[PDB]
């Protein structure tokens, strides 16, 4: 051949079993609102109902784990202190 690849420097991103189809706290989805918001509008009045990403690569609705912080303080699928490293998908 005329051109051949010798080295590769790909970067691999990983995500845990967040279950994009069932929120691990509310069991609706990784998007499309939550149990306490339901309808899309539901008198939104600004604020937000996006996805929250932790330091453990877990994803839930911001509302779900914001409320869950009052029940416990360690991400339910593990035993790690939950951070708020990202907001939204």
């Amino acid at each position: 051949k005329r051109f051949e690849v010798k080295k590769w420097n790909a970067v691999a991103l990983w995500a845990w079993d967040i279950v994009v189809d069932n929120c691990a706290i509310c069991r609706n989805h990784i998007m499309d609102l939550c149990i306490e918001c339901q309808a899309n509008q539901a008198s939104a009045t600004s604020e937000e109902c996006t996805v929250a990403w932790g330091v453990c690569n877990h994803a839930f609705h911001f509302h779900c784990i914001s409320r869950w912080l009052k029940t416990r303080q360690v991400c339910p699928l593990d035993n790690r202190e939950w951070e708020f490293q990202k907001y939204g998908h």
Partner: protein, 513 residues
Amino acid sequence: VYIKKVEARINEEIERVMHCLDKSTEEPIVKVVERELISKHMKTIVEMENSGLVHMLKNGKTEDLGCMYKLFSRVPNGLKTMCECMSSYLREQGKALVSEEGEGKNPVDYIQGLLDLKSRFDRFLLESFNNDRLFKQTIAGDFEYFLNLNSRSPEYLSLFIDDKLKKGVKGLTEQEVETILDKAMVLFRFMQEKDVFERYYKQHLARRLLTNKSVSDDSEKNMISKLKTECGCQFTSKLEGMFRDMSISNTTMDEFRQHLQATGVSLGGVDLTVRVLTTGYWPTQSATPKCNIPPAPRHAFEIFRRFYLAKHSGRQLTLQHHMGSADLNATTRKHILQVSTFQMTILMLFNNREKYTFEEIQQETDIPERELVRALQSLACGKPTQRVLTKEPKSKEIENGHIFTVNDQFTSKLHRVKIQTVAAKQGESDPERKETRQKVDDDRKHEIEAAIVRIMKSRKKMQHNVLVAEVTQQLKARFLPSPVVIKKRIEGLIEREYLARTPEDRKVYTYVA
């Protein structure tokens, strides 16, 4: 020359009064002499014209500044107008420097000039004003007032620090590097809107760590120390977590290579270098791109995906293309090219069959829209005499039916020639600026809500505008209060539980969970 003359007059008057008159003899004499001379010359001699205060400061006359400071210090309200005029000159210079009208300014040069001006003013202060507190306060206030005039000032500071950190070709030794870093952090001290600064610093960290390594290997840590001491125990810890994640990635990559060497079954896996990162630390590039991966690379990635889905059962190895690089071995000698994971698919298609066009690479490739054209022009359009992908229809604009060819280009004097079309002159185009502005707006939106839900759970309640002052004071060192944004966002939480903050019954808030 008037200041020297009046100083001599004061000296001779005090000498005469202390030698030719009574023992004390000096309080009313010196008071009235000052009130006549300085209190009348103060208003007009420093601002009118013909080498007053602004002109004697612009040219850099240290002795004039020192003697003016030592003379006007005796009379009250002299330092006040001195600092007022100095602040006016500083505002004029900043407006002349922070001017936004006109495109084509180098951010690194702009930050270098601003830091040079700051260092010059600091040197003048130290040499003449004897480190007076009033002058320092006035210059700090002037810097705070004039620096936040533009919203791309922290971005330009981040670009300057990235340029200084990528390679220490200027100032090889450590003393000048330490001094310039101290000056840079001092300049950053009198700056607002720290959120965009942190965001762009993290983006620069991602750019400098996901590219060729061995940039400083110790000055990066010096800079983390500086930011920790300045910004605080906040996001410098998150950058340390990012560095720990990078360490995990490299230690696991070499371990997996060693395990594959023992197996002796790594076919597509040759001299590979796979980095494992976490979603939270590094933002997704645009939309996680996808396209036909060259055969050998594809196999390597599939084996690595098996390794991650089995040992760390759960790690979803998502494929992407807007990151990384590669070394393409071409072949009169064997010169190795370089592809930044963008031209690999197009060149592989060329290897499979030459004489292709835009339609061929847009039909049997399933490649994103614009990042494809960016790589296509990085390969052919606007390329110096090192062309690795030539075309017959020589034109600036990109057509559809254009055939692609290859050239020798013996100008490369080595076997490792790279095409660094990316990371060009800082253009900071409108779409990327708008999207990062929206991202930082959402960042502020969560930053205010997290603070209000973390603080107010252990605090008192507000009636109309009590707790908003506290929440703005807590974020005073972060960014602007944005009263309308916080007012519109605090009233959205009433729709559900956990401190609904009832508007009509604004007398007692639910202190529950």
